[PDB]
Amino acid sequence: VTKQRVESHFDLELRAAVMHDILDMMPEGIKQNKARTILQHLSEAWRCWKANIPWKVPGLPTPIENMILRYVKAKADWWTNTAHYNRERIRRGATVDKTVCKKNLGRLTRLYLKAEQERQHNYLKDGPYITAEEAVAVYTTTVHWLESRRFSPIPFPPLSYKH
Amino acid sequence: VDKLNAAHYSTGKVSASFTSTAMVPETTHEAAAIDEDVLRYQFVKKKGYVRLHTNKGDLNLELHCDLTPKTCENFIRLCKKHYYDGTIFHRSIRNFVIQGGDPTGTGTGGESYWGKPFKDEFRPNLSHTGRGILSMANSGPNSNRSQFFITFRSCAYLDKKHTIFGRVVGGFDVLTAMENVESDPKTDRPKEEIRIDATTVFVDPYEEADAQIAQERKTQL
Amino acid sequence: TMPKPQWHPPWKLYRVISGHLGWVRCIAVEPGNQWFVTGSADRTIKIWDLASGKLKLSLTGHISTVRGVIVSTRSPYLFSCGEDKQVKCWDLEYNKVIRHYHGHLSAVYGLDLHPTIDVLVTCSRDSTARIWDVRTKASVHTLSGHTNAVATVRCQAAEPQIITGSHDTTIRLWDLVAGKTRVTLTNHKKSVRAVVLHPRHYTFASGSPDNIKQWKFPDGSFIQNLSGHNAIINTLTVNSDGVLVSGADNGTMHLWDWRTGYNFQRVHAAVQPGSLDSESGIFACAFDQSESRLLTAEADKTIKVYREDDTATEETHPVS
Q: Residues in domain PPIase cyclophilin-type (chain B)?
């Protein structure tokens, strides 16, 4: 196996491992549980993990959902760790490529935007971190300075303006 | 969610909170709260036995409250509301049907117990054949109401159209007098008012349902 | 319906390791109870001191999951095998690959080194198994016939020398030299992943979703159907005193006694901090050499270590 087919390969191995494991344990849908459809739902769960959108399809037999979450967690963690590693290569200069540059850029942004969405919602849920004492201190101290600099506050820009 | 209320799947909050970051992480799968009246209907496997007291006589009513649970229970709750007292069998078609169920007695109104026009329940076995078929008068699909009718004989063209909830098992001569009444061949209305005068619900299978349900609630509590 | 089952003291969790960055797929113990080897899907291979529970070493062999490892008791060799279609051998004085046995077509799933004939036997999702010369990279037989991924192999000196269980739900016993099928068993309904050979009773058990089954050598005589741990089973490990361990897929670990098949303990383990419960699971087990302590590699990047319970008596823990 070579760095070209690493992704396609690992994917094959993952999809087949899923097939073996559940669609030999979960059945009693014995004919065929529409495995193919359960794998469509696999792919969709991934997609939504990549786009940070809570994927929550309600009618799923909880053990099947348990499997799918085990597997998407596996795959996404693999994704991340390979991103860490490629970016370290590219920063170390080790090698060039016109793909593993654009690919890693894409992955690395998506990881960032996920971190951000997190940090905003956390701010809202946990209230302004700059308590009130600090806010009042900062505010008042600025006012002291400005006034001690006789700073004329700028006014909203008149229409028939000279300049 | 008690053990009885443990639904067949999870609420999905683990799935959501995992494939998204804007939501707080929860790391225990929680199965859903399954349902209510629908859960109830898993308990109502017994029939319903009602004596209708009409101006012609009494009609013994058998109802597969196991097989048409929503239909039968709407009827039984209008029964223990006695919502049929004063109502008339406002339509009669000779060798077709006798049809009633309206406090208006007009036949164009009525209620479901929940007010909500409820879904039609025709099953592979319930067919309007023979005398004593007790089928829902609905204005079409899933429009069920306070209106109901008995077939005077085999009416299979009402099958897959009119929700039978059971059969007539007593009051054969009562309904015989009913099928002998003149009805206006342009409105099919009985020239003698035939009316539901009173209700006696001998066996309330949803009573026994609620009993077992609440007992399990008490025991798991 | 049986003589009163013996009394084995229960097992308690005492020490937990968390060092990997992926599933821990396989784990083996060194001949002298000084250190154990772990192979993970993080692609690492990590050697740990058995006493201090400290990571003595890590080595970055593979390209993908390490699906199985095995340490040599006749040499300082350590053989790895993974879903990268490749199998490797490490010298552990210089800590390096020394030969790689090419040849399979897909993910290796497991392997074992024959205790006396210096060969490897590796099973692969490519519907086969192979017999490898240790040194010369020579495969003498493609033990073939399973209609699907040969989910595991175990090899032993006596006849038959090779048992392989599969996702074809069958079990097959092979003559090593002619490399031919000798016997089949097909009792199972759902695929069979774990086979284990008793040390002193010339017998062996196989696990599948239905339940465990037991067999007598060399023929394949069914013996005694073991049920109770109804979950996808992943490794069976048997101890000196007849204690038999089934690690299930979903974390639920079950213990029994080999003789009567008496399920006498269920342990239901707790996951790490950050891991959702749905990621719980057991993937491999192994008793130490001295058979006092037990290693289990779980599906949440952790290695849990259980110890015989010392405060156990017949009244603290009766047999029923």
A: 46-201
What are the structural domains, with CATH classification, of chain B? 48-211 (2.40.100.10)
- Which of C275, C276, C279, C280 to substitute to test the interface with B, most B CBs within 10 Å? C276
**Quick one: which of B183, B177, B101 has its CA closest to B134?**
B101
| B8 interfacial to chain A (CB closer than 8 Å) | yes
User: Among A23, A7, A14, which Cα is nearest to A43's?
Assistant: A14
- Compute the C-alpha angle C286/C292/C298, nearest 5°: 35
Single-letter amino acid code for the residue at A63: P
Q: DSSP letters of chain B?
A: --STTEEEEE-SHHHHHHH-SSS----S--EEE--SHHHHHHH--S-EEEEEEETTEEEEEEE-TTTSHHHHHHHHHHHHTTTTTT-B--EEETTTEEEE-BSSSSSS----TTSSPBPP---SS----STTEEEE--SSTT-B-S-EEEESS--GGGTTTS-EEEEEEE-HHHHHHHHTS-B-TTT--BSSPPBEEEEEEEE-HHHHHHHHHHHHHHHH-
Burial bucket for residue B30 (CB in 10 Å: 0-12, 13-18, 19+)? middle
Are C44 and C69 in contact, with CB atoms under 8 Å apart? no
Closest CA to C162 of C197, C133, C136, C193: C197
Q: Does A111 touch chain B (CB under 8 A)?
A: no
3-class secondary-structure state, position C229: coil
Among A56, A68, A110, A116, most B C-beta atoms within 10 A, so best to mutate, is: A56
- CB-CB neighbors (< 8 A) of B10 in chain A: 60, 62, 65
Token pair listed for A116: 């951000």
DSSP helix/strand/coil, C217: coil
Paired tokens of A39 = 């794998």
Please list the residues that pair with A72 across neighbouring strands: none
Q: How far is B5 from chain C (nearest CA, A)?
A: 21
Judging contacts by C-beta atoms under 8 Å, the chain C residues touching residue A70 are 278-279, 281, 299
Helix B69-80, helix B205-220: angle, nearest 10 = 100
Instruction: State CA C92 to chain mean position distance.
Output: 22
The continuous run of DSSP H or E covering A138 comes out as helix A133-147
Handedness of CA C92, C302, C163, A31 (dihedral sign): negative
Residue B16: its chain A contacts at CB < 8 A? 54-56
CA distance C241 to C259: 10
Whether C69 and C45 have beta carbons less than 8 Å apart is answered as yes
Q: Identify the sign of the CA torsion C177, C181, C183, C184.
A: positive
Helix (H) or strand (E) run with residue A140 in it:
helix A133-147
Specify burial of residue C282 (Cβ count, 10 A radius: 0-12, 13-18, 19+): buried
Task: Say how far apart CA C87 and CA C80 lie, in whole Å.
Answer: 6
Rounded to the nearest angstrom, the minimum Cα separation between C233 and chain B is 22
Question: What tokens were used for B2?
Answer: 């008690």
Q: How far is residue B77's CA from residue B73's CA, in Å, rounded to a whole number?
A: 6
Resolution stated for this PDB structure, in Å: 3.4
- Cβ contact B19–A45 (<8 Å): yes
The two three-digit tokens of residue C225, written as one number: 């159907």
Q: In 3D, which of B60, B61, B72, B64 has the Cα closest to residue B46?
A: B64
Q: Does B34 touch chain A (CB under 8 A)?
A: no
Task: Check CB contact under 8 Å for A65 and B15.
Answer: yes
Q: What are B47's two structure tokens?
A: 């029939």
Identify the CA nearest to C82 among candidates C58, C57, C111, C56: C111
Q: How far is CA C221 from CA C1, C2, C185, C224, C245, in A?
A: 21, 20, 9, 10, 22
Question: Chains with ≥3 Cβ pairs under 8 A against B?
Answer: A, C
Experiment type: cryo-EM
Is residue C131 a contact partner of residue C176, using CB atoms and an 8 Å limit?
yes
Which residues on neighbouring strands pair with residue C185, listed in sequence order? C171
